[PDB]
Amino acid sequence: MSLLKIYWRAMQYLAVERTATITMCVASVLVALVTLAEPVLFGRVIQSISDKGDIFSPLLMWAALGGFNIMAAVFVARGADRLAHRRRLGVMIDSYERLITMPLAWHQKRGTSNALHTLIRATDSLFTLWLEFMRQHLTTVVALATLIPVAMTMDMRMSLVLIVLGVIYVMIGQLVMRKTKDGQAAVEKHHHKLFEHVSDTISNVSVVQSYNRIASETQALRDYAKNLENAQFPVLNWWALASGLNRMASTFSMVVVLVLGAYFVTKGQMRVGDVIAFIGFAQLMIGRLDQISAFINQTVTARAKLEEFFQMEDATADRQEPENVADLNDVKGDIVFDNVTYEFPNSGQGVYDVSFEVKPGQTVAIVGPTGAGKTTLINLLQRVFDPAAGRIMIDGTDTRTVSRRSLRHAIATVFQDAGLFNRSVEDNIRVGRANATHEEVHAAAKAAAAHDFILAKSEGYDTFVGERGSQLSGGERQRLAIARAILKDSPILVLDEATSALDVETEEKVTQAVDELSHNRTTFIIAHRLSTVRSADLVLFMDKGHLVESGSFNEL
Amino acid sequence: MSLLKIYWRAMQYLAVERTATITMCVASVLVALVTLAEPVLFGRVIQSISDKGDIFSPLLMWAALGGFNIMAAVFVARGADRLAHRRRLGVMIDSYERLITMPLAWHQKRGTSNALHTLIRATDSLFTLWLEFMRQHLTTVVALATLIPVAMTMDMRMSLVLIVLGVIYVMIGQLVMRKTKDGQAAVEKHHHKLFEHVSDTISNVSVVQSYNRIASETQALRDYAKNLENAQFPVLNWWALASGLNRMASTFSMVVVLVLGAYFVTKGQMRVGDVIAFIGFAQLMIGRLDQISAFINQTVTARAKLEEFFQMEDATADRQEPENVADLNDVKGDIVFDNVTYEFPNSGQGVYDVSFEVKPGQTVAIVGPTGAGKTTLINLLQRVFDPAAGRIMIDGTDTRTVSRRSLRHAIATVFQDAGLFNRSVEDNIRVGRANATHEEVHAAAKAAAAHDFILAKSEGYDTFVGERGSQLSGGERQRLAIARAILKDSPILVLDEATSALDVETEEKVTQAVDELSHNRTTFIIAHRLSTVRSADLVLFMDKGHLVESGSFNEL
């Protein structure tokens, strides 16, 4: 019975615009009161024709209440829709902020692209929840609450039947939820499997289309759809049974109310006006119960997605030290490792017992066979995740006591996978300095030879590359990344696989240019080619996370 | 007014299960006729008590009609829900089939990852459309069609009231659509821009989190949200105005009906039983017209997405010559290019004036500076997209006249980006021969040195890599790709960027192993390192898509 918890969370997210929310609630209670009082006035005026006199005023009051209901309906529709859109946008904003705030391991483990789909689905479901909940729930709940005393003061037999009617509705709701929850969980897990398979297949379309695996993959997805649709039937059957049972209850209560009114015809206190007002009350409750039953169904359907979204909301517990914490500045270059190892989750390997000191003014290149632990070493230095048990002494200062904002501000790491956005070359490069100049961009590009091939094609700089540079081949993304790194101008430059299958003349030119630019500071080289480290000062080779010699520039 | 075309296309997707759909329509029309007959019998039995006699039978008949209504409601709910889910799954299946059918360029230009989101959104919108449209619209349309003659045979005064009511509703609907379509289009375009920015930011979270660009990105997305909500208010304002106007129309018509019935009380033809039955008709029409107005609102909201989906469906005009087109066999290796050049859309560069012959039994290596056109040459050899003007002579046969199914069955191309699924290592490698055996898989893996570092970690071969192999580093994706290529065992091997920044010992071992495997066939080398072509027999160098010499293995 987590429905109440879900509704509390929804109201917590919706309790931001205090003024707008309070005005909406006031409008809802007023319109509910008007809708309840309208049949009472209708009964008044129907009984009015039995006597004789100037009883035209009650009809005027009824017309005024009708016009007031119209105006209130307009205002509540407008305000509810506006509030729903504003709060949906705000929730999306804050959720996106936390989502991009998340660390790298959490994204690589689960997120990829499923996180975006979950965010969008949860956001739209919450939008629908906010709108329909607000309107229907406030109106019908206030109507029922104001109806209880009126039914208490009027004939109590009909109220006695009506409370049993409400008991019937809540009982069938409980019954359906009990018979439906397990099937809902199974359906959700099957749908997640299906969506994951679809996303994984679409994201790798070239591989699947280059191996004649279309038939096999579509048959597997057909199997997944079969598995999902196996568990879909019982829950909808139960929903149909619930709809039929409540329809039978509504018709049964209507017949009972009609018979009671017929008995009241023989003798009673009030008139056919009260009788028909009671009938109108009954039919209004029938309709609103139908809408809230449908609403309960939609809420049950979206339950699992809302639960997952709330879990990801509360999963943001990585405290960032809001208080002013010690930063670093004027990084001349002093890097010390002290017996720092890492063990992967549910795995092993990694680095083991690594320690070395870095003096300013000289560069260090790390070489060695693949899988040794060089990339994880680099992303440990930049601290994408915290080491197991060790001290990263930078400028004689631990990496744990340094704020994240200043940690990566004075660092310059090209990635092994040079990822790029789909924006223009200007936007994709001009990220190391938001206040830079086009002359600076040209100089940075010409230092990395990423301009000589772009001035002579594709509208010069203003070219929209595709996703991950899928529109200008792939031999340019490395040049663009190294140009961006040179533009960043940081004291510590990290060349992680910046030297790859390119022209040997291009490689030597890039190496000499970055040598001339980084002679003023200390920089890191992660490459297996022995021709890109002729100017290195303290080179070391690492195997399987264990150093062997870590000797001088010239070693055997 | 593409609304009718949208309904026709949706129904055409729906009327596939002819038996089930026809039964659903028959059940709906029968239950609608029953619901229309109910007030008539109610008015009869209310009028029947005016006289005296054994007139208990009409009351029992009315109860039986209510029971039929209940049972038919259950039947239509269950059948409609089941058919809707089945149709949604089938539509998703076939749309996914066409989506993966598309070539690479169409995905690189527009799809990438937005296509999946569009497909999911369109599919769920179509599900909701099918369900709600079928039930509500069919019931209410049959209701109106059966109601018009009954009221025409009864007093025509209320009939003239009713037709003006309908005219008011349809005219306000047309005016609202005219005032709202432009706002809907602007909202859709802004939403698409917002989603594109969100996806581009999330997909490359490492770069944005390693460059302190979180604040700028979130502020830009806030600006996008502001721009989106600027055009968001007028449309909802117009819908609120329309809702108020139709509420006023409904109350006004109810007032008119009450006045007409009050005059009819003085004198008329039928009784208050028929009067109140017509009152029930009026309120039922009011409610159903309100629901269908809301449905029109949802259809307008989803109209742009449905239009995009239908345009994508109709864009699938890739005729594959359904008749048996001549395939290829006896593939010993005969590849000749004859003056085939390609021009990119709205660009230049590419290959120009290429002419060379391939003799079976020898390997040919393509070298040259980056951006020359080697990757595009390779993927035209595999015919990922159709060349501009020329012939690809394979085994003395043009590549156009061979079906794509068997065209790529005798090829083995490792991509520049080694794409991998998030399945196991065994499932990711065993894709060329599903009926193969573990002995073959082990031999292929140990031939490509993708076994020595996986036999002693993570449950051996049963290791679940993440997306793009983001869980076992990146020095293994190349090994897995080359192992899979060796496993495929095709006559023409293509080592496109199969050699990269790896250990020199590992590189030389891989080269000798692939040489020994491919001695019985022909293969290509796309690499800039000069150490991987010592065993080549016919080397040529291509620059800017223009050859210079294209000589033999030994050249100056």
Ligand SMILES: Nc1ncnc2c1ncn2[C@@H]1O[C@H](COP(=O)(O)OP(=O)(O)O)[C@@H](O)[C@H]1O
């Ligand atoms: N996300 C991960 N989960 C588990 N193990 C990993 C992960 N990323 C890398 N590894 C392990 O770390 C080892 C070294 O990876 P890496 O440092 O990225 O490559 P290299 O050692 O060539 O620089 C690999 O053998 C791999 O198994």
Ligand SMILES: Nc1ncnc2c1ncn2[C@@H]1O[C@H](COP(=O)(O)OP(=O)(O)O)[C@@H](O)[C@H]1O
């Ligand atoms: N999708 C594309 N759209 C436009 N131009 C492209 C596309 N892909 C590649 N090119 C152009 O083709 C040239 C050669 O690319 P490619 O063959 O992939 O690399 P290489 O020449 O090193 O093999 C590049 O300079 C690039 O500008």
Ligand code: VO4
């Ligand atoms: O620019 V390349 O396609 O030779 O990596």
Ligand code: VO4
């Ligand atoms: O296997 V590596 O991360 O040294 O390219």
